[PDB]
Amino acid sequence: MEMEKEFEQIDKSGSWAAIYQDIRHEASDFPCRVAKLPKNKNRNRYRDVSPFDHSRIKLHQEDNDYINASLIKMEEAQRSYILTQGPLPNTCGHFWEMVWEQKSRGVVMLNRVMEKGSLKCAQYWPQKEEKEMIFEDTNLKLTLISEDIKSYYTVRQLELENLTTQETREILHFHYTTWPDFGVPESPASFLNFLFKVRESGSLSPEHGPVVVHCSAGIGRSGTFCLADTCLLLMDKRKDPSSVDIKKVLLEMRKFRMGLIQTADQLRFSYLAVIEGAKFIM
Numbered sequence: 001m002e003m004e005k006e007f008e009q010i011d012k013s014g015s016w017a018a019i020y021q022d023i024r025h026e027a028s029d030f031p032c033r034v035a036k037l038p039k040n041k042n043r044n045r046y047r048d049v050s051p052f053d054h055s056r057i058k059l060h061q062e063d064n065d066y067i068n069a070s071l072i073k074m075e076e077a078q079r080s081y082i083l084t085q086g087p088l089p090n091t092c093g094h095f096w097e098m099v100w101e102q103k104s105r106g107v108v109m110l111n112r113v114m115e116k117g118s119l120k121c122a123q124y125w126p127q128k129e130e131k132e133m134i135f136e137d138t139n140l141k142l143t144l145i146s147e148d149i150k151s152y153y154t155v156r157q158l159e160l161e162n163l164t165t166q167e168t169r170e171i172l173h174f175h176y177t178t179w180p181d182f183g184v185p186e187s188p189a190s191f192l193n194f195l196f197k198v199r200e201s202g203s204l205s206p207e208h209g210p211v212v213v214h215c216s217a218g219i220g221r222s223g224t225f226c227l228a229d230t231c232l233l234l235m236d237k238r239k240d241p242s243s244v245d246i247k248k249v250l251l252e253m254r255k256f257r258m259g260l261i262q263t264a265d266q267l268r269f270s271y272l273a274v275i276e277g278a279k280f281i282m
């Protein structure tokens with residue numbers, strides 16, 4: 001397997017840091033003028049993680065359509081993703097407005113609410129069936145329908161209601177709870193399992209709006225998810241599976257959102273995930 005041989009070559013020469021820096025250098029650079037506007041200061045979690053203006057998701061509300069979220073459109077793989085930041089206390093309503101407006105089926109969460117003893121995002125979904133959430137600013141209701149807690153992840157059924165029209169939708173919350181506080185998983189097994197469980201639900205399928213993916217910043221673990229998914233999809237489609245270049249696919253993705261894959265460790269893991277995912281397929 002061509003990319004596995006490249007993987008092993010980088011490992012032997014210990015050049016993960018150098019390969020990653022090269023990608024960082026070649027990465028696209030686009031304006032984030034809307035994100036930087038003073039009125040949107042409280043709508044961003046990190047100063048250095050902003051959506052490009054050209055691929056940003058726009059809220060269908062007049063006056064301030066801003067949400068820190070980007071549409072990643074992969075033409076060849078025929079797959080779209082919305083990467084966003086973990087909702088802030090003040091952007092929970094915005095978050096679900098987007099989900100509603102973009103006709104999303106699935107929400108993918110790759111972080112725990114608290115990690116390393118700090119809050120990484122707001123508790124933006126109901127933890128108990130009988131305690132529903134109403135978001136007064138965007139006029140939406142959210143109800144926990146069911147919860148399935150597994151070893152490495154948790155799946156939730158949620159009902160999102162548009163209070164204006166009384167229209168309701170079922171939303172699937174896929175929450176990966178076992179990403180380590182430091183570094184990356186030792187084995188891609190559980191991550192790949194999770195990815196394909198997301199796939200199974202139809203949440204990544206063309207008959208629905210784009211999946212909404214987030215970690216804390218919505219670039220690191222988020223990037224790994226999308227990147228692996230796209231690479232594996234490409235290997236299935238192409239006449240020559242060995243032609244799938246993960247660096248090229250990642251550079252392609254970076255045209256839509258900055259900072260996908262934060263460390264050389266994450267890049268290495270992405271490779272691993274694609275390689276191991278391929279060998280399973282087989």
Ligand SMILES: CCc1oc2cc(S(=O)(=O)Nc3ccc(S(=O)(=O)Nc4nccs4)cc3)ccc2c1C(=O)c1cc(Br)c(O)c(Br)c1
Pocket residue numbers: 187188189190192193194196197200276277278279280281282
């Ligand atoms: C690409 C999907 C996938 O890739 C994986 C890789 C691992 S792994 O990291 O342990 N690596 C691994 C493990 C086993 C093999 S193997 O080829 O020797 N065994 C099998 N291959 C196919 C069926 S049984 C090759 C590589 C574990 C589990 C998975 C797995 C799944 O979790 C998964 C796969 C499918 Br297809 C699916 O529908 C669902 Br749901 C989950």
